[PDB]
């Protein structure tokens, strides 16, 4: 609702660190199991997490926070209706 | 003052106004159960507009903005609340209420069965 964009780019940073702290986890698992159980046959299956998905941005947006308050906003809402252009003059016609 | 009068003639109802100085009377000399005596009246009156026009005059009687040390109830203001809170069967009797200072108005006038329609009165165009 009031994320601003360093808020975004958290989200998305710690999304992208989960999926990676994933990925390395997994693979390293899966060597394990190579180096315990020595298979007849070498196949890798390529990577286990090969993009970003659902998963990893609903755990990433379950830590999204605001950084900005609105009683900040608030503030700058109050300045810039302190640069206020009058309240006497949006009729101003000619005389014609 | 004028809009709720007008407001008022266009319904035919009868039309009180609790002024400030009356306010403050009841305020000062603690006798704030006459308001209850006035919403009795406005009951009676019935349809009837009860506007208490310049609310924030005991507001600003206790120091303005900056106030006492206490907070923004006052005794009137808080026999209003109660006979408002009362006041909710008689469906005739309408509650305008009138402050230049809305700043130190009492945030419980606001709350919902109380004065929620808020009005900005701004000065007049053309």
Same mark, same amino acid.
């Given at each position: 609702? @009031?994320?601003? @964009?360093?808020? $975004?780019?958290?989200?998305?940073?710690?999304?992208?660190? $989960?999926?990676? &702290?994933? *990925?390395?986890?997994?693979?390293?698992? =899966?060597?394990?199991? =190579?180096?315990?159980?020595?298979?007849?046959?070498?196949?890798?299956?390529?990577?286990?997490?090969?993009?970003?998905?659902?998963?990893?941005?609903?755990?990433?947006? =379950?830590?999204? &926070?605001?950084?900005?308050?609105?009683?900040?906003?608030?503030?700058?809402?109050?300045?810039?209706?302190? $640069?206020?252009?009058?309240? @006497?003059?949006? *009729?101003? &016609?000619?005389?014609? | 003052?004028?809009?709720?009068?007008?407001?008022?003639?266009?319904?035919?109802?009868?039309?009180?106004?609790?002024?400030?100085?009356?306010?403050?009377?009841?305020?000062? #000399?603690?006798?704030?159960?006459?308001?209850?005596?006035?919403?009795?009246?406005?009951?009676?009156?019935?349809?009837?507009?009860?506007?208490?026009?310049?609310?924030?005059?005991?507001?600003?009687?206790?120091? !303005?903005?900056?106030?006492?040390? #206490? !907070?923004?109830?006052?005794?009137? %203001?808080?026999?209003?609340?109660?006979?408002?809170?009362?006041?909710?069967?008689?469906?005739?009797?309408?509650? %305008? #209420?009138?402050?230049?200072?809305?700043?130190?108005?009492?945030?419980?006038?606001?709350?919902?069965?109380?004065?929620?329609?808020?009005?900005?009165?701004?000065?007049?165009?053309?």
């Amino acid at each position: 609702n @009031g994320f601003s @964009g360093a808020d $975004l780019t958290e989200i998305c940073q710690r999304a992208c660190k $989960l999926a990676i &702290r994933e *990925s390395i986890e997994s693979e390293i698992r =899966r060597e394990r199991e =190579r180096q315990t159980n020595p298979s007849a046959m070498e196949v890798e299956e390529d990577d286990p997490v090969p993009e970003i998905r659902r998963d990893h941005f609903e755990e990433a947006m =379950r830590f999204a &926070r605001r950084s900005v308050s609105d009683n900040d906003i608030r503030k700058y809402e109050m300045f810039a209706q302190t $640069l206020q252009q009058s309240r @006497g003059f949006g *009729s101003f &016609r000619f005389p014609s | 003052t004028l809009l709720a009068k007008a407001i008022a003639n266009e319904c035919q109802a009868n039309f009180i106004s609790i002024k400030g100085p009356e306010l403050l009377t009841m305020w000062f #000399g603690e006798s704030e159960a006459n308001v209850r005596e006035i919403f009795d009246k406005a009951r009676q009156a019935a349809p009837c507009v009860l506007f208490f026009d310049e609310l924030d005059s005991i507001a600003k009687a206790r120091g !303005g903005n900056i106030g006492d040390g #206490g !907070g923004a109830a006052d005794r009137v %203001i808080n026999q209003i609340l109660t006979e408002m809170d009362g006041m909710s069967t008689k469906k005739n009797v309408f509650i %305008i #209420g009138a402050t230049n200072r809305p700043d130190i108005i009492d945030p419980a006038i606001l709350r919902p069965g109380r004065l929620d329609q808020l009005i900005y009165i701004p000065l007049p165009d053309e």
